[PDB]
RNA sequence: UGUACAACGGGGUAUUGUAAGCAGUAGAGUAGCCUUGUUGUUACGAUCUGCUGAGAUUAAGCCUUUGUUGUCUGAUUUGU
RNA sequence: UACUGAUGAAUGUUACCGCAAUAGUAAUUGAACUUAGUACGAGAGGAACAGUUCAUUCGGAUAAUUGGUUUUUGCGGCUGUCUGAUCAGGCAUUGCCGCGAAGCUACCAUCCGCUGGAUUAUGGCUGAACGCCUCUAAGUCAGAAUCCAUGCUAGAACGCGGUGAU
């Protein structure tokens, strides 16, 4: 398990070369049902997100999104804790196939182990 | 396992200690404690602050170039492992530790002179 | 000769394995069937190594190598590097590369003779590839896709790229590699062909969704029989 | 909250008692069922995980463990318990004649004023070839289904200034009650070692009284299934040394544990966290049954033991590492 | 009435962020002057060095202590 | 006056180790890995038992980290107010600001959270009534997150035992 840093109603930036700039998190897939608390997302988790700023083709469409940059202090089983610079996520279909061809910035090791095609479409990991 | 040098201190960073940062440019920024990490947030020159080793290597408070210090190179070429080839390194590292401390003590006496 | 298996029920074989003429790398998961697939095909002729890179199953799309050498990223731990040298004979060299990027399988699309790399890479890596692997290095891209190891499967017999490659890019780049190129799909119409399957001069292991029309294309260009 | 832990009230003593004991295997010879010690600190362990079919198979894994200080515990008596329609019933306890000053201190609330007249006429009752002592041993040798052993802590070996030995009861799951009383006969006044109860890679359970705050806290709690990683020895130098690390160091951090001294005796390194806090007495039982899962199966290989100063922060392991990095200073030379 | 206890002293340990003062010839400038000083003076100088990873809290719920000093017995009740 | 809890005389005194009549009780649901792309099916699709890894909520612990914290009212800096001026802060209904151990204390964190009988529904076996048959009448085998124990919490203040002290 890894620590949660991306809440419901958060603006995570876009990391692939799809066309979008940012993603507004509306719902979390595979979540808990706490009392008086909205679900929170972590690295490599699939979340439903709408495009705030982007092209007319990408916009007006609710879709899943795999998180690539968490920026909240998470745990590695190799001793040290780490966090990236900014909150950011990429978009893909239910199958995990990337719309973009290349992903700018770092992609987390936990996300890369979980999703095979994300590890394929990654330029720089860690 | 690997014992790293801190980005701020150049001190031995152990597993389960400190914070590593990854920039968008993507290189490691390993720290020993949260204090040095908070100093790095404030955009401070590590060489300027005196309590690190970056100052001491630059100003010459402790020696930078030595025959013992070149032995601690980030080694690249992997070895086939012979039992005696590691058995020698046990006694070697213990010996080079003594020489490193003694030559530093010699540098210390070259630094403390001028008081008399 | 063209094999069809899976790892943890996933089609992307080239992600979790890297295969050369002298060796093959495999992850250490619960399933031994993926190791048994290569053990059935190759046997005790060339060594197949149980290992990880930076403590990850994702091994094929993170490394680089050929018959002469092996290259691993900065994130590689010392014990993995120790076991890798203990596994492999003097015919193959091993070297860790201190880099910005870690995805060597997404960058270095190489064989025994010709290497294709990323244009943004540092000069020192290009200087080390030609020396260790004994190859010729080329900063070249395919059809506006910046990662070339992901979007190209490569060996000495033939080559395979994604179907979005132009005819101009086909003929020009084949002249560089000295071998013909076919822009085709792997694993029931997927673009990522390097991660989709592993290949050399005498074997082509694919994922289980690789169809018979895709198999006929692979068998034609890589010339198995 | 949890309805089961009611009444959520204060425990009777600091030394909580074990409500149950492991069942029995009559085919075995005589063995103890539980062992006592003192909780002292929380250390960091990294190790390669040899757990099959895992997401972290053959990988290095970090986890915080606790080191319970366990001195060699000494027997001072043995008890017989008959089976009744009303439960169990102690028909006879019998004692070891030559008791320590520590156990004699347990029988008084004011040791200083007391004339130290503890086991005087009882030791005079011994003073012969038995007759009365051997009679009461025969009494337990005839009846009494379950046989429990009266033991106490060697508190002088412990760095704590509490100086008052805790009496506890530990039954025996080595069958044929004749062997139970004859084992206890041979083991009067004798000091029982730590490694002679538990080994490494064994699932166990600890009992303790939980860290009081204000009513909230100070209950007796029993947490089950905890793996013993290291059974250490005080006479053995380089306890912090693994098969990997092999640097000559004690498991004790630089300048003792947080609110606890040096470890100059045996220790148990338990997975995770035992209930209670430092300076508190715990009693480790042995699982009640054969708890065979793959969580129990794996024999661990401890790679490295963290012995940095938890008091504040730590960039070093031994005092040798401080002067190796710092060089030499003003007050030195 | 003894590795018995307490109060200090020492050590370990962290916290703050570089103590007041002193040595100053350094310090754009200069309040005012000259016999306009590669010793300017009489007050300063937004500061920097040596003391300065120092001063200080350093248990009031830290730990250790080969140092020092002060203590160690009042009243009541119980045993068909 | 129920109820949470807390003292308490008394059954030779005092002390130590316990037994357990009784009463309460506790965990919950999902996903993933192998079994598999196997049975199965024209294809489309697609299981499960066994072996594992995590998470949800609930509950019991716990402070090593994180965090509102604070009257170490810890130290640096600034101010209202001055003391014949540096020093000393004397003072400020708890003066402001930077940070901080000790504590208050949290899904804002971490760990822990069990196996034996006896059954219901049903599936049976032997086999009458009723010269066939029948899970039943007389027996007997298996079996629900049920039940009852094991475990856990409390210990009858008029339930009991063993042991030390004249």
- A 10 A CB-CB count for D211 gives 13
Q: Are residues D240 and D273 in the same domain?
A: yes
List phi, psi (to 5°) of A47.
-135, 140
Query: φ, ψ for residue C172 (rounded to 5)?
Result: -70, -45
The CA distance from D82 to D79, in Å, is 10
Q: Is residue D1 part of a domain?
A: no
Q: Are residues D188 and D201 in the same domain?
A: no
Task: Please give, one letter per residue, the 3-state secondary structure of B72-108.
Answer: CCCCCCCCCCCHHHHHHHHHHHHHHHHHHHHHHHHHH
D56 CB and strand E closer than 7 A: no
CATH of the domain at D139: 3.30.1430.10
Same structural domain for residues D221 and D323? yes
Q: Is D276 exposed, middle or buried (0-12, 13-18, 19+ CB in 10 A)?
A: buried
Considering the domain architecture, whether residues D163 and D265 belong to the same structural domain is answered as no
Q: Is A109 helix (H, G, I), strand (E, B) or coil?
A: helix
Residues C8, C207: Cα–Cα separation, whole Å = 11
Sign for the CA dihedral angle at C191, C196, C198, C204 comes to negative
Token pair for residue D22?
Answer: 């492991």
Let me know: does C86 contact B81? Beta carbons within 8 Å.
yes
CA angle B91/B94/B97 to nearest 5° reads 145
Contact indicator for A109, C56 with CB cutoff of 8 Å? yes
* Those residues with Cβ within 8 angstroms of residue D125's Cβ, 6 or more apart along the chain or in another chain: D132, D133
* Same domain membership, residue B80 and residue B45: no
Going by C-alpha positions, the residue among C25, C22, C53, C219 that lies closest to residue C206 is: C219
* Chosen domain end from B24, B47, B65: B65
- State which nucleotides on strand F lie below 7 Å from a protein beta carbon: 4-6, 15-21, 24-26, 31, 33-37, 51-64, 66, 104-105, 107-116, 150-155, 160-166
Q: Does an H or E element contain A112, and which?
A: helix A109-114
Chain C residues within 8 angstroms (CB to CB) of chain A = 10, 12, 15-16, 54-58, 61-62, 75, 100-103, 106, 144-147, 150-151, 190, 192, 194-195
Give the span between the Cα atoms of B44 and B36, in whole angstroms: 10
The single residue listed with the structure tokens 């890596």 is C125
In sequence order, which ranges of chain D are alpha helices (DSSP H)?
Answer: 101-106, 120-126, 133-142, 177-186, 294-297, 319-326
Q: Where are the domains of chain A?
A: 5-126
Cis upstream peptide for C143 (omega within 30°): no
CB C88 within 8 A of CB C47: yes
Whether B60 and B8 map to the same domain: the answer is yes
Q: How far is the alpha carbon of A55 from chain C, nearest alpha carbon, in Å?
A: 20
User: Domain range holding C222?
Assistant: 1-225
DSSP string, D81-144: EEEETTEEEEEEEEE-SS--HHHHHHT-S-TTTS---SSHHHHHHHTTTSTTHHHHHHHHHHS-
Residue pointed to by tokens 């608390």: A37
Domain count, chain C: 1
Exposed/middle/buried for A12, CB within 10 Å: 0-12, 13-18, 19+? buried
D277 in contact with nucleic chain F (CB within 7 A) = yes
Closest CA to D280 of D260, D264, D252: D260
d(CA D264, CA D261): 9
Helix axes D133-142, D177-186, angle to 10 degrees: 150
**Phi-psi category of D130—alpha, beta or left, where left has phi over 0 and alpha has psi -120 to 50?**
left
Q: Which is nearest to C97 in space by CA: A36, D166, B78?
A: B78
Integer Cα distance of C3 and C222 in angstroms: 13
Cβ–Cβ contact A123 with C under 8 A: yes
Smallest CA-to-CA distance from C178 within C159, C194, C160, C191 is with C159
List of residues 6+ apart from C221 with CB closer than 8 A: C157, C158, C159, C160, C180, C181, C182, C184
Q: Exposed (0-12), middle (13-18) or buried (19+): which is A95, by Cβ within 10 Å?
A: exposed
Indicate the SS3 state at residue D295.
helix
A78 lies within 8 A of chain D by CB:
yes
For position C198, which CATH number holds? 3.75.10.10
Contacts of D213 (CB under 8 A, 6+ apart): none
| Closest C-alpha to C172, from C180, C160, C162, C183 | C180
Beta-ladder partners of B22: B28
Contacts of C64 (CB under 8 A, 6+ apart): C70, C71, C72, C104, C105, C107, C108, C110, C129, C133, C149
For chain C, the residues before each gap (C–N > 2.5 Å) are none
Tell me which chain D residues have a C-beta less than 8 angstroms from the C-beta of C30. 52-54, 57
What is the rounded CA–CA span in Å between residue C195 and residue D145? 69
User: Which residues from chain C sit within 8 angstroms of residue A109, using beta carbons?
Assistant: 54, 56
CA–CA–CA angle A28, A33, A35 (5° rounding): 120
Among candidates C34, C37, C39, C36, which has minimal Cα distance to C59? C34
Nearest one of C69, C122, C66 to C95, comparing CA atoms? C69
Resolution of this deposited model, Å: 4.1
Between CA A20 and CA A91 the distance in angstroms is 9
SS3 D181: helix
Q: How many domains does chain B have?
A: 2
Backbone angles phi, psi at C33, to 5 degrees: -65, -35
For CA atoms A46, A51, A53, A55, the dihedral sign is positive
B/e letters for B66-75, b = 16+ CB within 10 Å, e = fewer, are eebeeeeeee
Token reading at B52: 């690190």
Hey, is A111 helix, strand or coil? Answer: helix
For chain D, how many structural domains are there in total? 2
Q: What distance lies between CA A6 and its chain's CA centroid?
A: 9
Q: Are D263 and D234 in contact (CB under 8 A)?
A: yes
Domain span at residue B52 reads 2-65
Give bridge partners of residue C114 from the DSSP assignment: C136
Method used experimentally: cryo-EM
The CA distance from C153 to C218, in Å, is 10
**Chain centroid offset of residue D93 CA:** 23
Same domain, B51 and B7: yes
Long-range contacts at D183-186 (CB < 8 A, ≥ 24 apart): D183/D30, D184/D75, D184/D78, D184/D147, D184/D149, D185/D137
Please state, in angstroms and rounded to a whole number, the distance separating the CA atoms of residues D9 and D157.
33
Copy the structure tokens of residue A80.
Answer: 């040290």
Domain assignment of residue D165, given as a range: 72-192
Tokens, residue C82: 């120790």
Long-range (24+ apart) CB contacts under 8 A made by D5-9 are: D5/D219, D8/D215, D8/D216, D8/D219, D9/D215, D9/D219
Q: In what order do the strands lie in the sheet with C93-96?
A: C64-65, C69-72, C93-96
Residue closest to D21 by CA, chosen among D293, D283, D310, D322: D283
Compute the distance between CA of residue D259 and CA of residue D276 in angstroms, rounded to an integer: 14
Q: Look up tokens 């074997």; give the residue.
A: C203
Place of tokens 């204000």: D214
Separation in Å: E9 C1' and D255 CA? 21
If asked whether residues B11 and B60 sit together in one domain, one would say yes
Residue D57's alpha-carbon distances to C72, D178, D303, in angstroms, are 21, 48, 15
Interface of B with D in 14-73 (CB under 8 A): 14-17, 32-33, 62
Q: Identify the residue whose tokens are 């006496």.
A: B109
- One domain for residues D53 and D86: no
Tokens of D120: 């005087």
- Degrees (nearest 5) of the Cα angle D268, D272, D273? 80
Going by their DSSP bridges, the two strands C69-72 and C64-65 should be labelled as antiparallel
How many whole angstroms separate alpha carbon A90 and alpha carbon D243?
A: 45
Q: How far is CA C107 from CA A123, C15, C74, in A?
A: 8, 13, 15
Beta-ladder partners of C43: none
Q: How far is CA D132 from CA C159, D94, D189, in A?
A: 97, 10, 19
Q: What is the CA radius of gyration of chain D?
A: 22
Question: B112: how many CB neighbours lie within 10 A of its CB?
Answer: 12
Q: How many other β-carbons are positioned within 10 Å of the β-carbon of residue D320?
A: 13
Phi/psi-derived region of residue D279, left when phi > 0, alpha when psi is between -120 and 50, beta in every other case: left
CA distance B23 to B46: 18
- Dist. CA A120–CA A97, nearest whole Å: 10
DSSP D288: S
**Residue D273 neighbours by CB under 8 Å, 6+ apart:** D42, D64, D66
- Alpha carbons within 13 angstroms on the beta-carbon side of residue D43 total 29
Cα B88 to Cα A112, B81, B82, B93, C86: the distances in Å are: 40, 12, 10, 9, 19
Pair D187, D221 in one domain: no
Which residues are bridge partners to C159 per DSSP? C154, C181
Q: What Rg do the C-alpha atoms of chain C give, in angstroms? A: 16
Helices B83-112 & D319-326 angle (0-180, nearest 10): 60
C125, C103 Cβ separation under 8 angstroms: no
Q: Are residues B18 and B53 in the same domain?
A: yes
3-state SS, one letter per residue, for chain C: CCCEECCCCCCCHHHHEEECCCCEEECCCCCCHHHHHHHHHCCCCCCEEECCCCCCCCCHHHCEECCCEEEECCCCCHHHHHHHHHHCCCCCEEEECCCCCCCCCCCCEECCCEEEECCCCCHHHHHHHHHHCCCEEEECCECCECCCCCCEEECCCCEEECCCCCHHHHHHHHHHHCCCEEECCECCCECCHHHHEEECCCCEEEECCCCHHHHHHHHHHCCCC
Instruction: Please provide the size of chain B in residues.
Output: 116
Nucleic strand F under 7 Å from the C-beta of D255: no
Asked whether strand F has any atom less than 7 Å from the CB of D258, the reply is yes
Task: Answer yes or no: do B73 and B85 share one domain.
Answer: yes
For residue B100, what are the CA distances in angstroms to A107, B69, B75, D25, D324?
41, 8, 19, 61, 8
b vs e for D90-115, b when ≥16 Cβ sit within 10 Å of the residue's Cβ? ebbebbbbebbebbbbbeeeeeeeee
Q: Report the alpha-carbon distance of residue C18 to residue C46 in Å, rounded.
A: 13
CATH 1.20.1250.20 given to domain A5-126? no
Please give the Cα distance from D127 to D125 (Å, whole number). 6
Q: Which of C8, C26, C27, C30 to mutate to test the interface with D (most CBs of D within 10 A)?
A: C30
């Amino acid at each position: 398990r890894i620590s949660l840093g991306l809440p419901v109603g958060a603006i995570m930036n876009c990391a692939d070369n799809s066309g979008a700039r940012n993603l507004y998190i509306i719902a979390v897939k595979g979540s808990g049902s706490r009392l008086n608390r909205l679900p929170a997302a972590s690295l490599g988790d699939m979340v439903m997100a709408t495009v705030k700023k982007g092209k007319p083709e990408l916009r007006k469409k609710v879709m899943p999104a795999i998180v690539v940059r968490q920026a909240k202090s998470w745990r590695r089983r190799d001793g040290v804790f780490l966090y990236f610079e900014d909150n950011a996520g990429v978009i893909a279909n239910p199958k995990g196939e990337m719309k973009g061809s290349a992903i700018t910035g770092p992609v987390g090791k936990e996300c890369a182990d979980l999703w095979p095609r994300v590890a394929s479409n990654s330029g720089v990991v860690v | 396992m690997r014992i790293y040098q801190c980005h701020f201190c150049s001190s031995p960073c152990y597993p389960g200690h400190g914070i590593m940062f990854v920039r968008n440019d993507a290189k490691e920024f390993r720290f020993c404690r949260s204090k040095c990490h908070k100093a790095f947030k404030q955009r401070r020159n590590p060489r300027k602050l005196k309590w690190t080793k970056a100052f001491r290597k630059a100003a010459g408070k402790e020696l930078a170039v030595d025959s013992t210090l070149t032995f601690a190179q980030r080694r690249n070429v992997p070895v086939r492992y012979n039992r005696e080839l590691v058995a020698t390194t046990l006694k070697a590292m213990a010996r080079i530790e003594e020489i490193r401390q003694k030559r530093e003590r010699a540098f210390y006496k070259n630094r403390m002179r001028g008081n008399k | 000769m063209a094999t069809r298996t899976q790892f943890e029920n996933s089609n992307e074989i080239g992600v979790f394995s890297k295969l050369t003429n002298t060796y093959c790398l495999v992850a250490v998961g619960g399933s031994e069937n993926f190791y048994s697939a290569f053990e059935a095909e190759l046997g005790d002729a060339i060594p197949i190594v149980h290992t990880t890179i930076a403590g990850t199953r994702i091994i094929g799309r993170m490394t680089a190598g050929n018959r002469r050498g092996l290259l691993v990223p900065t994130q590689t731990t010392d014990q993995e590097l120790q076991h890798l040298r203990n596994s492999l004979p003097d015919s193959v060299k091993i070297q860790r590369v201190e880099e910005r990027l870690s995805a060597l399988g997404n960058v270095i699309c190489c064989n025994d003779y010709v290497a294709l790399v990323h244009p943004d890479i540092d000069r020192e890596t290009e200087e080390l590839i030609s020396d260790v692997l004994g190859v010729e290095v080329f900063r070249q891209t395919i059809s506006g896709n910046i990662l070339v190891g992901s979007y190209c499967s490569l060996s000495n017999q033939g080559g395979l790229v994604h179907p979005q490659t132009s005819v101009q890019d086909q003929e020009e780049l084949s002249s560089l590699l000295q071998v013909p190129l076919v822009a085709g799909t792997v694993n029931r119409g997927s673009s990522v062909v390097g991660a989709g399957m592993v290949v050399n001069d005498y074997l082509a292991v694919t994922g289980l969704d690789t169809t018979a029309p895709e198999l006929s294309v692979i068998e034609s260009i890589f010339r198995l029989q | 909250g949890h309805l089961g832990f009611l009444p959520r009230k204060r425990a009777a003593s600091i030394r909580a008692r074990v409500k149950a004991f492991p069942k029995d295997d009559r085919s075995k010879p005589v063995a103890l069922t539980s062992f006592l010690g003192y909780k002292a600190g929380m250390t960091t362990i990294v190790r390669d995980l040899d757990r099959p079919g895992s997401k972290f198979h053959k990988r290095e894994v970090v986890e915080a463990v606790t080191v319970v200080d366990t001195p060699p515990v000494v027997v001072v008596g043995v008890v017989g318990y008959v089976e009744t329609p009303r439960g169990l019933r102690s028909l006879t306890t019998v004692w070891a004649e030559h008791l320590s000053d520590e156990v004699k201190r347990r029988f008084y609330k004011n040791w200083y004023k007391s004339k130290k007249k503890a086991f005087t006429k009882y030791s005079a009752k011994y003073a012969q070839d038995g007759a009365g002592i051997e009679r009461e041993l025969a009494r337990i040798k005839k009846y009494a289904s379950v046989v429990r052993v009266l033991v106490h802590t060697q508190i002088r070996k412990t760095p704590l200034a509490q100086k008052k030995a805790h009496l506890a009861e530990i039954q025996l799951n080595g069958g044929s009650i004749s062997e139970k009383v004859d084992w206890a006969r041979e083991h009067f006044e004798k000091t029982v070692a730590v490694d002679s109860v538990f080994e490494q890679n064994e699932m166990i359970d600890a009992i303790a009284v939980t860290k009081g705050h204000g009513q909230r806290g100070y209950h007796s709690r029993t947490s089950i299934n905890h793996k013993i990683y290291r059974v250490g020895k005080g006479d053995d130098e380089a306890n912090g040394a693994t098969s990997f690390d092999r640097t000559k160091k004690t498991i004790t951090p630089m300048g003792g544990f947080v609110h606890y001294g040096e470890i100059k005796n045996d220790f148990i390194m338990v997975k995770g966290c035992i209930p209670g806090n430092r300076k508190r007495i715990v009693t480790l039982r042995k699982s009640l049954y054969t708890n065979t899962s793959r969580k129990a199966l794996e024999e661990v290989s401890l790679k490295w033991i963290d012995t940095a100063s938890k008091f504040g922060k730590g960039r070093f392991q031994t005092p040798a590492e401080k002067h190796a990095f710092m060089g030499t200073l003003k007050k030195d030379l």
